[PDB]
């Protein structure tokens, strides 16, 4: 998931936005 | 915005900045 992707790979702020409430 | 390499607590800091008062869900295994 996003937690793993951001650390093992790279991720964007736009992808992080999908986790907002 | 630039791409990100975030591990541990740094990811939580990023989520806080991106989501603000809207809140967010930190979900590892997901
Ligand atoms: Zn650190």
Secondary structure elements and pairings:
The complex is a heterodimer of chains A (about 20) and B (about 30).
Chain A: H1 2-8, H2 13-16
Chain B: H1 9-19
The structure holds zinc ion.
Protein name (chain B): Insulin B chain
Structural class of chain B: mainly alpha
- Whole-Å distance between the termini of chain B? 25 Å
Query: Helix segment count of chain A?
Result: 2
Could you state the oligomeric state of the chains shown? heterodimer
Number of strands of chain A: 0
Tell me, briefly, the overall form of chain A: flat
Residues in helix, % of chain A: 40-55%
PDB class: hormone
Keywords: receptor-binding, insulin design, rational, therapeutic implication, Carbohydrate metabolism, Cleavage on pair of basic residues, Diabetes mellitus, Disease mutation, Glucose metabolism, Hormone, Pharmaceutical, Secreted
Assembly: dimeric
Entry title: Design of an insulin analog with enhanced receptor-binding selectivity. Rationale, structure, and therapeutic implications
Walk me through this protein's architecture.
Chain B: This is Insulin B chain. Chain B: It comes from Homo sapiens. The PDB classes it as hormone. Keywords: receptor-binding, insulin design, rational, therapeutic implication, Carbohydrate metabolism, Cleavage on pair of basic residues, Diabetes mellitus, Disease mutation, Glucose metabolism, Hormone, Pharmaceutical, Secreted. It forms a dimeric assembly. The complex is a heterodimer of chains A (21) and B (30). Chain A has two helices and no strands. Chain A has helices at residues 2-8, 13-16. Chain B has 30 residues and is mainly α. Chain B has one helix spanning 9-19. The longest helix of chain B is centred in the middle third of the chain and has 11 residues, at 9-19. Chain B is globular, with a radius of gyration of 10 Å. Chain B starts with 8 loop residues before the first helix and ends in an 11-residue tail after the last helix. The interface between A and B is medium-sized, with 16 and 21 residues. Bound molecules: zinc ion.
């Amino acid at each position: 998931x996003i937690v793993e992707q951001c650390c093992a790979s790279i991720c964007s702020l736009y992808q992080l936005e999908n986790y907002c409430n | 915005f630039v791409n990100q390499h975030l591990c541990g607590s740094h990811l939580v800091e990023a989520l806080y900045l991106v989501c603000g008062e809207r809140g967010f869900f930190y979900t590892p295994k997901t």
